[PDB]
């Protein structure tokens, strides 16, 4: 697995989302697109907007096709309306190919475009099933596979920094790698463990057990996937179902009790600060999620450090002071494994073998005493009961 050409093709190391460069139309209009495995719609800005440095101009593409049909897409945070149509797409730092894909020209949007993010579109990599209007709208990756020889899987390495990067730093620095059609062994260390995609709509998985510094949260596993558990590059936080969230924060609060933090912090609202270089990483617990394996009654665990769940935010008063935000939050829509998780590993979306694999990221942030981890197997039974129906 050597796609050294696609290696380092991502951006927004310490920004608002990881994007890849793409081009749409003829002649090629360049646009940075947010990699989002939590949805299935390919959409781009198509009209000027305040937080848009550039956008898709249909009238200038010789290959554009207006489907004369509107589309509406609502996300946990933000939404947009647009006009459906198709055009030719390319990924400069992806496989050398061109495919005709469905494209939503965003005309009306609300709390979607993040000012300064530097991305003008979104690449929904999930399955047709959750695509809008309905599943008849072939998602991008599906078009890519049907129209070429590119293998049916992709890999993601999202690189966090551990420290805040200013405007020009997020621009001139690798944010990670999105390997389309294969795996690059250089992106990870150790072994790759695969968990089954329960059902092909979101990239759904099943969590069988959660630990806070080795201590079992000991709750009925169904709770851990209450509604569902998905993997989403487009979500910042490790989002957890209300009940699981309350329990985790209680345990995290107990593990770090030698220091007190204002309630707002645990809500992810107010940031906590320490003298530059004095962040007490050791007082915070590591967090482990156990996922079902391909082998029956067997499972493995992925473990993250506070360096993954304590996000670096630039302090108002420039003070060298290192500041963070608790990036573990509540969800009424199931567990969401966002960047907090993905930034710790190399994740393989083996759509072809209907599975997702994890391995310690060659770029995850850590200290000299602890590191992210992926280990197995563990003999736990009746794990089918974990799934929500």
DSSP 66-95: EEEEEEEEEETTEEEEEEEEEEEEE-TTS-
**Residue numbers annotated as active site:** 36, 232
Span of 36-44, 51-59, 92-100, 135-143 interacting with ligand 23I by CB under 6 A: 36-44
Check binding of 237 to ligand 23I (CB under 6 A): yes
# chain residues binding ligand 23I, by CB under 6 A: 26
Check binding of 76 to ligand 23I (CB under 6 A): yes
Contact indicator for 152, 349 with CB cutoff of 8 Å: no
Closer by beta carbon to ligand 23I, 225 or else 236: 236
Q: How far is the CB of 91 from ligand 23I (least distance, A)?
A: 19
3-state secondary structure of 290: strand
Quick one: which H or E segment has residue 6? none
What is the C-alpha separation between 118 and 271, in angstroms, rounded?
Answer: 24
What is the C-alpha separation between 34 and 78, in angstroms, rounded?
Answer: 14
3-state secondary structure of 311: strand
Query: After which residue numbers is the chain interrupted with C–N beyond 2.5 angstroms?
Result: none
CA 338, chain centre distance (Å): 5
Span of 48-56, 184-192, 236-244, 279-287 interacting with ligand 23I by CB under 6 A: 236-244
Closer by beta carbon to ligand 23I, 8 or else 36: 36
Contact indicator for 206, 227 with CB cutoff of 8 Å: no
**Residue 33 contacts by C-beta under 8 Å, 6 or more apart in sequence?**
19, 20, 21, 22, 44, 119, 120, 121, 122, 123
Check binding of 325 to ligand 23I (CB under 6 A): no
Q: How far is the CB of 240 from ligand 23I (least distance, A)?
A: 10
x/- map, 143-172, ligand 23I, by CB under 6 A: ------------------------------
| Torsions phi, psi for 220 (to 5 deg) | -65, 130
Q: How far is the CB of 165 from ligand 23I (least distance, A)?
A: 12
Q: How far is the CB of 337 from ligand 23I (least distance, A)?
A: 10
Closer by beta carbon to ligand 23I, 263 or else 368: 263
What is the C-alpha separation between 90 and 123, in angstroms, rounded?
Answer: 12
Query: Which of 24, 43, 73, 137 is close enough to bind ligand 23I by CB under 6 A?
Result: 73
Check binding of 118 to ligand 23I (CB under 6 A): no
Query: Which of 312, 338, 357, 387 is close enough to bind ligand 23I by CB under 6 A?
Result: 338
Check binding of 383 to ligand 23I (CB under 6 A): no
Q: Is 46 left (phi over 0), alpha (psi -120 to 50) or beta?
A: alpha
Check binding of 78 to ligand 23I (CB under 6 A): yes
Query: Which of 232, 251, 347, 359 is close enough to bind ligand 23I by CB under 6 A?
Result: 232
Question: Which residues in this chain contact ligand 23I in the complex, by CB under 6 A?
Answer: 16-17, 34, 36, 38-39, 73-78, 112, 114, 122, 130, 132, 232, 234-237, 239, 329, 338-339
């Amino acid at each position: 697995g050597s796609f050294v050409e696609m290696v380092d093709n991502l951006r927004g190391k310490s920004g608002q989302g990881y994007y890849v460069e793409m081009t749409v139309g003829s002649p090629p209009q360049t646009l940075n697109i947010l990699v989002d495995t939590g949805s299935s719609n390919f959409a781009v800005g198509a009209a000027p907007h305040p937080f848009l440095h550039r956008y898709y101009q249909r009238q200038l593409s010789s290959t554009y096709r207006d489907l004369r049909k509107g589309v509406y897409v609502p996300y946990t945070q933000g939404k947009w309306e647009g006009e459906l149509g198709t055009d030719l797409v390319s990924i400069p730092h992806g496989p050398n190919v061109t495919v005709r894909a469905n494209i939503a020209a965003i005309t009306e949007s609300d709390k979607f475009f993040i000012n300064g993010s530097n991305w003008e579109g979104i690449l929904g990599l999930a399955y047709a099933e959750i695509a809008r209007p309905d599943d008849s709208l072939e998602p991008f990756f599906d078009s890519l596979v049907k129209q070429t020889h590119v293998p049916n899987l992709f890999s993601l390495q999202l690189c966090g920094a551990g420290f805040p990067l200013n405007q020009s730093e997020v621009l001139a620095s690798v944010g990670g790698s999105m390997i389309i059609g294969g795996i690059d062994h250089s992106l990870y260390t150790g072994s790759l463990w695969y968990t089954p995609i329960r059902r092909e709509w979101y990239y759904e998985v099943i969590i069988v057990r959660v630990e806070i510094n080795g201590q079992d949260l000991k709750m009925d596993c169904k709770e851990y996937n209450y509604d569902k558990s998905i993997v989403d590059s487009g979500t910042t936080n490790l989002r957890l179902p209300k009940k699981v969230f309350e329990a985790a924060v209680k345990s995290i609060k107990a593990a770090s009790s030698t220091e007190k933090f204002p309630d707002g912090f645990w809500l992810g609202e107010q940031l906590v600060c320490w003298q530059a270089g004095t962040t007490p990483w050791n007082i915070f617990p590591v967090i482990s999620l156990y996922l079902m394996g391909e082998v029956t009654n067997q499972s493995f665990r992925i473990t993250i450090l506070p360096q993954q769940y304590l996000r670096p935010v630039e302090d108002v008063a420039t003070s060298q002071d290192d500041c963070y935000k608790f990036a573990i939050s509540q969800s009424s829509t199931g567990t969401v494994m966002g960047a907090v998780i993905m930034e710790g590993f190399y994740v393989v979306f083996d759509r072809a073998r209907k599975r997702i694999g994890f391995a310690v990221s060659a770029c995850h942030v850590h200290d000299e005493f602890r590191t992210a981890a992926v280990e197995g197997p563990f003999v736990t039974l009746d794990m089918e009961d974990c799934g929500y129906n």
